[PDB]
Motif scaffolding. Structure first.
Motif, short mmCIF file in Angstrom:
data_model
loop_
_atom_site.label_atom_id
_atom_site.label_comp_id
_atom_site.label_asym_id
_atom_site.label_seq_id
_atom_site.Cartn_x
_atom_site.Cartn_y
_atom_site.Cartn_z
N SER A 1 11.93 73.09 -7.99
CA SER A 1 13.08 73.18 -7.07
C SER A 1 14.21 72.13 -7.61
O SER A 1 14.13 71.34 -8.38
CB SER A 1 12.69 72.49 -5.70
OG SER A 1 12.26 71.28 -6.05
N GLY A 2 15.57 72.50 -7.19
CA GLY A 2 16.34 71.49 -7.75
C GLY A 2 16.50 70.30 -7.14
O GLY A 2 17.02 69.08 -7.47
N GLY A 3 16.18 70.33 -5.72
CA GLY A 3 16.18 69.06 -5.13
C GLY A 3 15.12 68.35 -4.34
O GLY A 3 15.18 67.34 -4.03
N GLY A 4 14.06 68.95 -4.70
CA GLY A 4 12.77 68.62 -4.17
C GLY A 4 12.55 68.76 -2.56
O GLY A 4 12.61 69.92 -2.02
N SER A 5 12.67 67.81 -1.85
CA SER A 5 12.86 67.76 -0.33
C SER A 5 13.68 66.62 0.08
O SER A 5 12.94 65.56 0.74
CB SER A 5 11.57 68.07 0.77
OG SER A 5 11.86 68.09 1.93
#
Ligand SMILES: [Cl-]
Ligand SMILES: [Cl-]
Lengths: 404, 404
Positions: free
Chosen positions: A105-109
């Motif tokens: 993912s680009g951002g994780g969560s």
């Protein structure tokens, strides 16, 4: 040495919840962009987004999904679709050291990271946090949350590279096949959609803000009045497979991955150099002895970025430039999921013989002149397609896919 | 079919702000663990950490550092050190398509993800958030924040895989060399230290909580009275270089990377599988014609995790254990930075001919019966060393390094 082919795909996108719906949307030029009450409510200036319109409730086993943020949910559902599309049985791919997973993912969560911190700061502290936040919040969540339930025994990790994330995942999966280390690698990504992360992009002036009253018109790559990207979420997964292994099982093969470029600008953090991109496309084209029939551009609907890429496209192709469209004008920018989703849109065009339109171009940017920006769905037999992914931080990936 | 060597290293750790402080701490058995009022103030039960004891103020150019979270700062400094160490001129590594960077973090920046949402929710909204949060918060922050200022033109992305993150970064760098794609790849990682992330580990019960009054005794890998890991922050970087290229420039070669295992458990999400770790070590040892002289274990000081690793090591080596020590008993667990920091401790042992001690073992776990756990600094001529990284989420990496 070894050659890598794509033998199955799966997708959860703003424009469809599986490949049938996505194919229809691509043919129709249908926008996946909607007004977002959540974004508006958060105080953002951009109130539009490419949301997943699948109700995911109940689709994943309780003990599996408890570890998952939305990026992982979207990636998991995409992987289930890909396994089905590939015709793989658990006997074949599970508990198999030659089968791997590379998905990020680009951002994780940010949603779960912020949830963690908000809960911890209340009167209940650790008890409010609960024991599930790490897998949801960690940058490797999308790989970790999928490798366990699918019983993967080979490589298992997440590459991240902002907008190039899942393209670099696909390219690294190809490298595992070329190195002889894996027979199959599931490659892709996912990205949640949330004000927590979206507001970071709005704060840097990256998101469209002038079109909230007409959500379907906000994303408008190459249009003279573009004003930034429309954020999106979703997932995607492709089955990257060694060629002989695929043929031996009667696989359905979409395309061979005949090129993979990966470069760095080493110049600017937030804007492309063009120079990095030129090198990346040339690398992806090296030894590819057939012309590019269709290019799915990075094209996010940003004033500077859209035309830097076109400049790069000119320098690479000279007087033999390909048909081009920016599917983000329909789909929005799903960040870590963009690379695999756009590889999938390109594979659907290759498989079904058409070029999807670059929509919302009311006045074409002058720096697009002389290039075939395709603005109406066009049936055409394609052979070789290219897909660019140019991420924040000056990281570049290009994939080239060709019929076998 | 190209060979890869380490020609430079750099490190910012709980036990040293450089390799001299690191080497000295390794020889001395020195704990980097301190009491943390921040952790206590946050409401956590774990009040101990492996902090970086370095005032970084003014150490990085104002227009470079403004894009950075602590993970990037720590990785940047480590990379500065590694470049100096390798004898690399700006003219040697900068603006060069054959020179890359693969470096990541376990968590990105929980602190800046949280800062963004906090700023958004307050009176200045987007103006409080600011234009630098994406590069601080995104999963690829470490690679993005370094590739630009160091003018990197080759590969540029991050891998994340929890405890294995920077070990897979190093292995992927090796792959880039093996494929003939890159001549040099800087490989490593960084991890911030913060309650925002630490509390999520504490909320799952992973962190040590019984030794707050004696911080230096808290991290006690393989001890019968261990009670969880001690979180740490920091950074590391190695220069991974193609053999001939390194020789041609008269580089100082620490070691060849002669093995790299990368596997997945595919099993119980929560517990490390044992089997994945066996398969990982065996993969890393394949074709290696010399005994493993020393093994830097993964061992984080957790009740279940430590025994699984012991049991896996006994399965792999039978009655012919290498010398083993868990440097985490000194350093704590730096998550994303662990793989590269521990590869570096390992290289310093191979370079300076000694085995660092496994500290704080008062009563050795019984599952360690039949192994060679070294608990005092021991001078020894090492030739082949191994380092294990068995990451949360079932993702394993092992590196084998050998004198040329
Ligand atoms: Cl059809
Ligand atoms: Cl010495």
């Amino acid at each position: 040495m070894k050659r890598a082919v794509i033998t199955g795909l799966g997708i959860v996108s703003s424009i469809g919840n599986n490949q049938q719906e996505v194919l229809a949307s691509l043919r129709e030029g249908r926008s996946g962009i909607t007004f977002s009450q959540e974004l508006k409510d958060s105080g953002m200036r951009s109130h539009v987004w490419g949301n997943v319109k699948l109700d995911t409730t109940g689709l994943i086993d309780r003990k599996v999904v408890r570890f998952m943020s939305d990026a992982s949910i979207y990636a998991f559902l995409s992987m289930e679709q890909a396994i089905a599309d590939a015709g793989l049985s658990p006997e074949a791919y599970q508990n198999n050291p030659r089968v791997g997973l590379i998905a990020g993912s680009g951002g994780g969560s940010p949603r779960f990271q912020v949830f963690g911190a908000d809960a911890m700061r209340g009167p209940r502290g650790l008890k409010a946090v609960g024991p599930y936040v790490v897998t949801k919040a960690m940058a490797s969540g999308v790989s970790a949350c999928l490798a366990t339930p699918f019983k993967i025994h080979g490589v298992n990790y997440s590459i991240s590279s902002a907008c190039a994330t899942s393209a670099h995942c696909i390219g690294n999966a190809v490298e595992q096949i070329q190195l002889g280390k894996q027979d199959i690698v599931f490659a892709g990504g996912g990205e949640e959609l949330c004000w927590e992360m979206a507001c970071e992009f709005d704060a840097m002036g990256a998101l469209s803000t002038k079109y909230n009253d007409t959500p379907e018109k906000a994303s408008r790559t190459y249009d003279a009045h573009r004003d930034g990207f429309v954020i999106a979420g979703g997932g995607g997964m492709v089955v990257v497979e060694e060629l002989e292994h695929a043929l031996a099982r009667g696989a359905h093969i979409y395309a061979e991955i005949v090129g993979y470029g990966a470069t760095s600008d080493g110049a600017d953090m937030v804007a492309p150099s063009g120079e990095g991109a030129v090198r990346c496309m040339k690398m992806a084209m090296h030894g590819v002895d057939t012309p590019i029939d269709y290019l799915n551009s990075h094209g996010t609907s940003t004033p500077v970025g859209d035309v830097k890429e076109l400049a790069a496209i000119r320098e690479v192709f000279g007087d033999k430039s390909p048909a081009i469209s920016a599917t983000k004008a329909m789909t929005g920018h799903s960040l870590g999921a963009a690379g695999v989703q756009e590889a999938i849109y390109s594979l659907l065009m290759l498989e079904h013989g058409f070029i999807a339109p670059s929509i919302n171009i009311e006045e074409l940017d002058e720096q697009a002149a002389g290039l075939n920006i395709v603005t109406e769905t066009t049936d055409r037999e394609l052979t070789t397609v290219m897909s660019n992914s140019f991420g924040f931080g000056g990281t570049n990936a290009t994939l080239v896919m060709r019929k076998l």
